């Protein structure tokens, strides 16, 4: 699935629950290291709700496995996010995306 | 500079003379300034003639005769509002049989060897309209049936009465004063 | 004292620039003199703006906003090349415009907004793109023609406004007459709807238009149908399918409201 | 010649063809800019009439068969093998001149560019070959800018060939201009071409120059220059310790930078080696520096993940102790007294080493160099000596900028020339032989 | 500056700093070099670190010729010593490399057959050491981008290396990685029999396995013992280091051997599955040189250093953020500051046309393409490009255009489309509207006032690429229309103040580059209608102070602007007149 490496520890007790939206700052990077997305650049925290299939699946289980206040790295294989078509104009076909995700708040 | 802009636009390469709101407004403004119109004294009439001469000089000194020739030439014999305004401007600058304007126009035409001017003049003459019994009868039938008139004037008969009169007044003003040069060149 | 007015300020600045330097840029010269003419002819702004001024009741503000957004989409599609997505967007916009109640309540507003011209111009672009290669994007021409015919049927004034463009629709007539299931959705049908059951418009109809239709009918009666013979129809010497459409238009041209326009 | 007739029998009017092509180029030469508006307009009208007459007599086609008959041969050497050797030299010039002739014949003429649509596909099929790329690109640009109809036939393969021209022939702005003309023509945008150009060029990130906003990174080092050499009095083990008093994880959108470790000079010069003086480069971004960020070991701008108990990026109140062993090249770290499970080994020991820290904005750290300067929160490993013990006796230990130039008043800035080598760093006694 | 030499330049930005100008130079009429500049002059110094650049055609020593490959031959690139055996010839070791690198796989998997041949990822190039050139002076292999060593004497023993030995908890080294910038071998030691090789020039063949990172070398048809194992994602540049002992030294033979792709199939993506060897014009020989300049940053990071005490050690404190945009050359794996393009003309032109292509692909409301472009050019990049004062004029104009095209063009166009149409609702606030603000018949400031005419709705969508929804493809991407507004007002005020002094150095290098993009952005914001009340009053005071007094400093109208700026001012005046006309129409509707 996704590999999670911890940059900064979190509380370790609060995790996302079903139907609970998550507020995250993330930075998207290709495997070579090129950046393609950053909620930090947009200066707006990104809000998505756990399990409505509104975000790429790898980001979904990565956020689910993360805890509140934690900063973790998400490595998403091509199959789990943008399998073969990729994102037209952004993500090339068969690309692995590395995400630097911080779970700011749970609500 | 405005007259030069219009002259360059006229002299630019086009298949058709595009309607220009700026030209259509400023030509009218210049014509009004030129003409600017009970028995009056000789001194009053002379002051009117001399004032008209100076008012026409303010334009034909800056190159208005060449502009009004170039626009007619670029018209390529298509009747339109641009030609209607240009003819009015030419009449305004030529009123009174202005010999200086006549000479300027003659010299410009001769040195440019402009054939499009005369071709467009002939084309405008063919495109000029006349009375139409069919149109008059149709419009009278509409009136008799009593349907509210779609347009107040109903000018389908004699489509443009002002354009024809202006076109021929321009050509008469060209030769006024027994200008043998135009009388032969035309 | 000081200028104290935008009109005076612009009138001074334009003349000052022009007499200060010989402006090299024709666009700059045009902009300068347009501003000067606008400042001097203050009443011209009103005589131009007032025809495009419409007042609406407070209850219909949201529906007017929605109709305006749809019309903005339709107009913006004028600046883009035709495509499948453009086809879908215009079906969306036209459907919404038809469903809007303002479209049935304020015909003068729709005429002033000039949407019949916009729809006509888009259909014109579609037809002029690949005119010889049958009719590309048939749904665009069909929907445009249906909407234009509905526009004609809404009001008599709308019918006259659309009749003012009858001439060009006649050169754009011979497009989709041969193909069935598109009957009633061609520019010829739009012209017929513009002249349908209006004595004023039938009388104002000119002879050259009838001559154009007669030449089209003569061509259809003289030579076969290329599209039909390409699909494999027997090669008879003439084109009844399109001849019938031209005859149908001539019927509305000559006959109106039980009587026959003798002229 | 194609039918393989004898070269003597075949008569190629090579010289006359070249001279006529030059004459035709001069005849279709566009008006000059310095000319007056009236003369320019007259000459443009004459050019338009000449172009109409030529296209109506069908000169565009004749030029096309000439171009095709010249491309049946691959190269000038091949054409010199088939035909005469003089024709071999003239082959490139004639082929170019024909392309400029086509460009001048169709330039600015709507009707000619409309009739060129049928052959437009044939034109783009030879864009890849180097002998005609410039002329074909110019003709393509003229056709695209003039004729809207020509854009309606450009397909996915045609656009991909144009992009492959960037891929293989290098960076060129004219083909970018051709692509822009493909996107927009006469105020009308073609969504299909826009989408295809986007989705076929942008995602690769291999042709267009890439841009990113990067924090400045500054490096700070003590005065000590410790190294290893034969027959010289330097202790080969050293130890220093760094404390993080405060660190903002994100002062800006980009993550903050904080790396600690050792760096090596090139030779015996005092300058840090292999790295740029300024930029976003820190410790570990070259092969002369060896850094640790709390999660990765950095060397040569490549990071390797190292395991550590409760591993985390360097936070506030984090203590890093750096160890250097020059007897067997080894650099080891210990975070909060806990040993990191990795080390740098068998590096280059030709030059001198020194402690170094690299940081971006939002960093407040303190060097614990031992003794008078500081006290170690953790006991040094056995053998390892505190770094203050390497200071030369007269000089004073100072933490100064690793690079020469810092932030200061412009006219007071000290421009520094090349420095001398530190032969005194390694005190190798050389008594004379007796 | 010589060895251990220190000096300072005083360009006289502040005349009082100059110490002998008064006694000599002032009366004579000489002016300080920075007589009137609002910002300091950028220094350019000699770069210490050598870089690889293409061999100049006018190089006095190096000659590079491209040999086209026939059916029986292979594409070859020959390096030739032009001035060998001549006076002042240089015999030092010269470092050569090819422009494009071979990129190893991101993850390492753990006659000729066409299927194997197409499915393989192994690439090959060979170098022919010409007869008469000593093989001991020639090294052949691969180098990475980090190689910047110009030692006069070069040996394979002094290549920069490191071994990162990751270990487990117990301390057992589960893996160790050797990392180096140079992976090359010497031909003299590579050739085993020695002496006579004149039957054919010494042919060292380099074989690279992109799927495993194995670097094996073939010398005269036999595998050499030396092999290099590299780590994933390494970009290896073919490279030959040679010291010229003959006019003909070596030759880059770009061919293939049995069951191996040629180098072109790995270098180029369009030729990935083409077994035929190729040498496109992009690939060319580059040599390591010292002739390059470096640009000092105008501003450095502020670092404060002090010894707190004997206990607390030395404090290092940097609390102020500083940033620069980096231009990354994809093929060279190199990044330079974007402000370095003021002297690199070809890169400046290519990037300006790239910006124009970015503007064109998203033209006329291509919202999804604009969203895609938000990835390549981001909000901080756009804001930094807009605000930076040392930006080249062309790049500044391009970035101002790109911002408008991506974020503002759609709504600006919509409002311009619905500008001559006045649909005025009949509401109470509409009835309250009057021609004149008070009983005194004095015009109010244009734009300011209650306007009730119907307007298009402002709607934007957040450009997030982790989302998988498609509703974001409607509407232009969101942008901070408030930060942008304040920044635009501030920069307009600063430009008005500084440009009136007629400084020698405006932003972008010319007054046009300084003003036209800024006024274009200002006009776009005005059309969009972001400006409200106080901002509109301030921007009107900027245009002309005397006319728009509420209820010396000279404005743009009499600032003596160039013609392109005058056109933008005409556009602004047209918008103000349109606002007045709309106010008149609304007042008439209110009276009615």
Numbering used by the authors:
A (entry chain H): 2 to 108
B (entry chain D): 3666 to 3702, 3710 to 3858
C (entry chain D): 2053 to 2315
D (entry chain D): 436 to 869
E (entry chain D): 1207 to 1316, 1414 to 1854, 1889 to 1929
What does the paper say about this structure?
Structurally, RyR2 is a 2.3 MDa homotetramer consisting of two functional regions: a massive cytoplasmic region, also known as the cytoplasmic shell, which comprises several regulatory domains (NTDs, NSol, SPRYs, RYs, JSol, and BSol domains) and the stabilizing subunit calstabin-2, and an activation core and pore region, which comprises the Ca2+ binding site and the transmembrane domains. Dysregulation of Ca2+ handling, characterized by aberrant SR Ca2+ leak, is a pivotal pathophysiological mechanism in a spectrum of cardiac disorders, including heart failure (HF), atrial fibrillation, catecholaminergic polymorphic ventricular tachycardia (CPVT), and other arrhythmogenic disorders. Here, we solved the cryogenic electron microscopy structures of ryanodine receptor 2 variants linked either to heart failure or inherited sudden cardiac death.
RyR2-S2808D channels were recombinantly expressed in HEK-293 cells and isolated as previously reported. We determined the cryo-EM structures of the RyR2-S2808D channels under conditions that resemble diastole in the heart when cardiomyocytes are at rest (concentration of free cytosolic Ca2+ below 150 nM and ATP in the mM range).
